[PDB]
Design a protein around this ligand. Structure first.
Ligand SMILES: CC(C)(O/N=C/c1ccc(C(=N)N)cc1)C(=O)O
Ligand SMILES: [Ca+2]
Length: 223
């Protein structure tokens, strides 16, 4: 997260870290057994880490649970990043409490102009590299579809939305991939892509979760 703020320990209790010997992506806990992340975050041997603030220090509130299965969206296209969403099933149910909590799936799509909370342990620099220990947060508005399409001509599908600041300086980044974009207390987006980070006229592009609720519900009802 570039140009954001320190969230505060466990103030984003649905935030997960995906670990494969090291943090490599974020995710969102949607119930005691399931995490939503980006399909581009797929790999084998994922351990889900819940209740994290400092990802490099065991602080006492964590739950580390291995993934038992990963389900990439059936229409995910890794070239265009259309349908950039994946479900991850935990080997055992998370114990839900104040520091580890699920986030609601939306019943309707969020509106342009709506403020959302984006979070992660990704790069905090728009140029160069610096990775934080503690969870970072960013408040950012959903952009109009026309401004989103104008920023990325020929690349924005109906399964994507833009959020952030056209002036640059504030954005998600590499390492935040798969993490939550929460608007009005519902999981509305997943950190997906963008040209660099916090670049002028290049806002963040996010997987449009409201399009996937039916697939999510059906998949979790059968796996
Ligand atoms: C695989 C892929 C496309 O992952 N992309 C991550 C990403 C996340 C957020 C942003 C952003 N909001 N500017 C930009 C890029 C990559 O590393 O090239
Ligand atoms: Ca920790």
């Amino acid at each position: 997260i570039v140009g954001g703020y320190t969230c505060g320990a466990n103030t984003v209790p649905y935030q997960v870290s995906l670990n494969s010997g090291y943090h490599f992506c974020g995710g969102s806990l949607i119930n005691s057994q399931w995490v939503v992340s980006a399909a581009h975050c797929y790999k084998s041997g994922i351990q889900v880490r819940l209740g994290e603030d400092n990802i490099n220090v065991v602080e006492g509130n964590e739950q580390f649970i291995s993934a038992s299965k990963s389900i990439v969206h059936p229409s995910y296209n890794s070239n265009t990043l259309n349908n950039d969403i994946m479900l991850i099933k935990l080997k055992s149910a998370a114990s839900l409490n104040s520091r580890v909590a699920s986030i609601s799936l939306p019943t309707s799509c969020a509106s342009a102009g709506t403020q959302c909370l984006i979070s992660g342990w990704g790069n905090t620099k728009s140029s160069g590299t610096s990775y934080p220990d503690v969870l970072k947060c960013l408040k950012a508005p959903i952009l109009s579809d026309s401004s989103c399409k104008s920023a990325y001509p020929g690349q924005i599908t109906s399964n994507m939305f833009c959020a952030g600041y056209l002036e640059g300086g504030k954005d998600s980044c590499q390492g935040d991939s798969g993490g939550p974009v929460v608007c009005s207390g519902k999981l509305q987006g997943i950190v997906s892509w963008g040209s660099g980070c916090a670049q002028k006229n290049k806002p963040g592009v996010y997987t449009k979760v409201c399009n996937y609720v039916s697939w999510i519900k059906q998949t979790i009802a059968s796996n």
